Amino acid sequence: STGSATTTPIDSLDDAYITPVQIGTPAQTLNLDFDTGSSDLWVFSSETTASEVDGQTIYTPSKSTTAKLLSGATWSISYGDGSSSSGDVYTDTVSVGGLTVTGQAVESAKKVSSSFTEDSTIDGLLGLAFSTLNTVSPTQQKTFFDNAKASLDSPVFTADLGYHAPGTYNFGFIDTTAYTGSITYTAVSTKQGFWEWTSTGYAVGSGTFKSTSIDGIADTGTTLLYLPATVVSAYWAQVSGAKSSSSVGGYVFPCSATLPSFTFGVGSARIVIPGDYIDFGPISTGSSSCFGGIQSSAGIGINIFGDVALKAAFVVFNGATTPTLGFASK
User: Fold this and answer.
1) Same-domain check for residues 131 and 77
2) Which cysteines form disulfides?
3) CB of 134 closer than 8 Å to CB of 40
4) Which residue among 145, 174, 203 closes a domain?
5) Which of these, 172, 102, 122, 92, lies nearest to 19 by C-alpha position?
């Protein structure tokens, strides 16, 4: 089997991407944030504290003839951005782009943190990291991909995120029309539960390539590119007037600037992030100070190849017995 679904930016800045997901019988379609940096599929629901729901579409398990309470199971998750959610668990039928999993754990939120409430466009998350990170207790549950894997034509999914435009998540096949040149594959460590890999270096604009190993995670659920402070300083030094602002919470730059590109290495291959992808717009409405899309990972504890990086590539998440990651230009 295979599946193919369009993913759409939630706003004009590509702050996140939502993908429609069918849950239950009859189908209830919710728009979920596909997140390769976590491993829970959780949704706003009829069980979510009423004051914490503000415009989201909810899953109502009592209206699904295939929903079953997973007795005694609870979940609770906290993300790197400080947000969180928790609740109980149902199993139900879940379909993405024509690919169906029966008996998928659907984690129903009883509580969500304010950032979730405040984002009316995201109805929940669909985790695509390794199932070892799943938070369900006392019986850990599998991700949608892990459940689907054996049925797929090939044990892979691909992320093809757009810049200020829709893109595609495919399951079970590689669309050879969706990228240019060849796909370069690179090793993955699953030791921390992530799609963790090592970039071979970077360049800023038309500058020379610096060969240096940068360990990080491919994370569709993180907006920006978080890299070591040395790398990030070298980038922003090429933008007149750019500075790190403790009050704003990272590097800002004059909105009048033209940003240089940023290149990252994948083995001997190179992925170029155009400068415009690094612009996240005014820090506040009407401001001439703009927020940068490349930020320091210092104090996160891990480097994160988030959407800023991934949307410059066609990315293969290869879930073979020994997982790997592939990157192509597009």
Assistant:
1) yes
2) 255-290
3) yes
4) 174
5) 122
| Radius of gyration over every alpha carbon of the chain, rounded to an integer in angstroms | 20
Q: Are residues 118 and 96 located together in one domain of the fold?
A: yes
Does 227 lie in the same domain as 166? no
* Structure determined by: X-ray
Look at residues 138, 158, 174 and tell me which one is the last residue of a structural domain: 174
Resolution in angstrom units: 1.1
Beta-carbon contacts of residue 89 (< 8 Å; ≥ 6 apart)? 69, 70, 73, 74, 75, 105, 106, 107, 108, 136, 141
DSSP 8-state assignment for residue 147: H
Active site residues: 35, 199
* Token reading at 317: 């998440």
Q: How many distinct structural domains can be found in the chain?
A: 2
Same domain, yes or no: 36 and 75: yes
Q: Is the dihedral of CA 170, 174, 178, 181 positive or negative?
A: positive
Q: How far apart are CA 162 and CA 310, in angstroms?
A: 9
How far is residue 23's CA from residue 11's CA, in Å, rounded to a whole number?
24
Are both 257 and 271 inside the same structural domain?
yes
Contact yes or no for 84/77 (Cβ under 8 A): yes
Please state, in angstroms and rounded to a whole number, the distance separating the CA atoms of residues 4 and 276.
Answer: 28
Question: What is the distance between the alpha carbons of residues 189 and 199, in angstroms, rounded to a whole number?
Answer: 13
**Residue 268's CB: how many other CB atoms inside 10 A?**
7
Both tokens of residue 9? 């930016």
Among 232, 206, 197, which Cα is nearest to 327's? 197
Which domain, by its residues, includes 277?
175-330
Residue 7 and residue 161 in contact, taking contact as beta carbons nearer than 8 Å: yes
- Rounded CA-CA distance 164/193 in Å is 30
- Kindly state whether residues 118 and 222 are assigned to the same domain: no
* Secondary structure class of 186 (helix, strand, coil): strand
Q: Which of 326, 295, 301 is nearest to 215 (CA)?
A: 301
How far is residue 61's CA from residue 39's CA, in Å, rounded to a whole number? 21
